Amino acid sequence: SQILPDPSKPSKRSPIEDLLFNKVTLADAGFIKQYGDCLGDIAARDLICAQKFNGLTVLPPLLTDEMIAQYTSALLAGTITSGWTFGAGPALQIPFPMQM
Amino acid sequence: ESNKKFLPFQQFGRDIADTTDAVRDPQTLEILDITPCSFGGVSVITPGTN
Ligand SMILES: *[C@@H]1O[C@H](CO)[C@@H](O)[C@H](O)[C@H]1NC(C)=O
After folding, report:
1. Cβ atoms of residues B35 and A39 within 8 Å
2. How close B14 comes to chain A (CA, Å)?
3. Are the Cβ atoms of B17 and A35 closer than 8 angstroms?
4. Please, is A6 exposed, middle or buried when counting C-beta atoms within 10 Å of its C-beta (0-12, 13-18, 19+)?
5. Least CB–CB distance from B36: residue in A41, A47, A53
6. Distance separating alpha carbons of residues A59 and A77, to the nearest angstrom
7. How far apart are CA A91 and CA A98, in angstroms?
């Protein structure tokens, strides 16, 4: 249960993945740092607006976090329900104690 | 319009990159903020010209 995805939460991440994502602090994720946000003028000028005003930008990655989580979940399901058979061809079912 | 509280002996405002971002009008003693005009990057997506 500690490594399988949790359907209760919207992003469908395991508790360990939740802790890992909460532990690491990210500055810019490549999202839309809109020019409106910089012109908001909240009297707190951060470094992101200064970087943007001088021609430096950050591009978002092609793969989102949800797709990586889906890949991890697929790998976990394959390695749990089949063992090492799905890595060399069609997946073959086998009880877990027999695999161990 | 600027919300900054300039001291009575101050006339200009600078930022990290050493550029003027706040100014005081010579006629009316009012504080103003300067923001660069809108800009962005453009990309073109196309298949082959054949
Ligand atoms: C400068 O002259 C204009 C026009 O007469 C006037 O409105 C303004 O108050 C003057 N500036 C100062 C600092 O008195």
Report:
1. yes
2. 11
3. no
4. middle
5. A53
6. 32
7. 16
